[PDB]
Amino acid sequence: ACLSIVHSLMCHRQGGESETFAKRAIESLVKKLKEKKDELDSLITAITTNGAHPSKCVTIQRTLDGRLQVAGRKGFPHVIYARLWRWPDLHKNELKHVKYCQYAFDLKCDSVCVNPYHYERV
Amino acid sequence: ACLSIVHSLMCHRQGGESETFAKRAIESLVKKLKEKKDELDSLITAITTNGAHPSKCVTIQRTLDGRLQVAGRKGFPHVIYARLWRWPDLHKNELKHVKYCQYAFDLKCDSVCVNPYHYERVVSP
DNA sequence: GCAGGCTAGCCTGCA
DNA sequence: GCAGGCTAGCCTGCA
Ligand SMILES: [Cl-]
Ligand SMILES: [Zn+2]
Ligand SMILES: [Zn+2]
């Protein structure tokens, strides 16, 4: 079910993290999108087609400091997933959201867009 | 739980429908957004400020045929809420979605955006 | 567990 | 081929 989805998404990882961390990060994200069909499908089709066409926001709940914990490690959620699928060498303060993103990290909403195609590297 | 949201939204109705119809339409929408905090806040702020600043999509589940039933009446959900808060005289095929709307009626997604400020009025062909 | 109300989905009657 | 009406299924207020 989710295991089938995870594996397809793992095939697009850029190697900027260990296999165990990437699996942990993907499983965590997929579980959160299990009851959000449209957003899950937006993530899968944007990852696979390399953000060819505009995609919908893929959101998760924002924490107070804005950091997500995956396998005992903390980091910004939009950074973790942009590093994972687009920029393995991504650093701090290198991500600027696209104009059409509604839940971009910087907006400090209750939700964060972790769609890596909703950010451009700067 | 919170009927204070329904009351504040009822104050912005344009009178194109009966008080009873409007109350049922708003109650139905608010119940669907009860566990979607961001979407509910985007709706309240968009209505109150007359869509001054860009707002997020306010979505509900799409039915098979696209129509929503409220108080025994069926209609397109984006039309029902655009009539209620923006155009009381609104007719069929007079809405066109804004470029930044992700869940527009026309896209036939799982979800339908009912944010009236995510649609602009057009002349029917 | 139960009473009762709301509506998506299905069906039909005029067109 | 639509508009609109009927109701199974789902949900909730209840004691
Ligand atoms: Cl009204
Ligand atoms: Zn986004
Ligand atoms: Zn929208």
Author numbering:
A (entry chain B): 15 to 136
B (entry chain A): 15 to 139
Give the text the authors published on this PDB structure:
Smad proteins consist of an N-terminal MH1 domain, which binds to DNA, a linker region with phosphorylation sites for network regulatory inputs, and a C-terminal MH2 domain that is phosphorylated by the receptors and binds other Smad proteins, LDTFs, chromatin readers, and transcriptional co-activators and co-repressors. The receptors for TGF-β, nodal, activin, myostatin, and other family members are membrane serine/threonine kinases that phosphorylate and activate Smad2 and Smad3, whereas analogous receptors for the bone morphogenetic proteins (BMPs) preferentially phosphorylate and activate Smads 1, 5, and 8. These receptor-activated Smads (R-Smads) form heterotrimeric complexes with Smad4, which is required for the transcriptional regulation of most target genes. Focusing on the human and mouse Gsc promoter, here we identify specific Smad-binding GC-rich motifs and provide the X-ray crystal structures of Smad3 and Smad4 bound to several of these motifs. The structures determined here reveal that the β-hairpin is flexible and adaptable to bind with high-affinity several variants of the consensus sequence GGC(GC)|(CG), which we refer to as 5GC SBE.
The GC-rich region of Gsc contains a conserved GGCTG sequence, which resembles the GTCT-AGAC SBE. The X-ray crystal structure of the Smad4 MH1 domain in complex with a GGCT-AGCC oligonucleotide was determined at 2.98 Å resolution (space group P212121). The ASU contains two Smad4 MH1 monomers and one dsDNA molecule. The conformation of the Smad-bound GGCT motif is intermediate between that of GTCT and that of GGCGC. We analyzed the superposition of the Smad4 MH1 domain bound to different DNAs with Cα root mean square deviations (RMSD) of 0.47 Å and of 0.45 Å for the GTCT and GGCT, respectively, for 114 aligned residues.
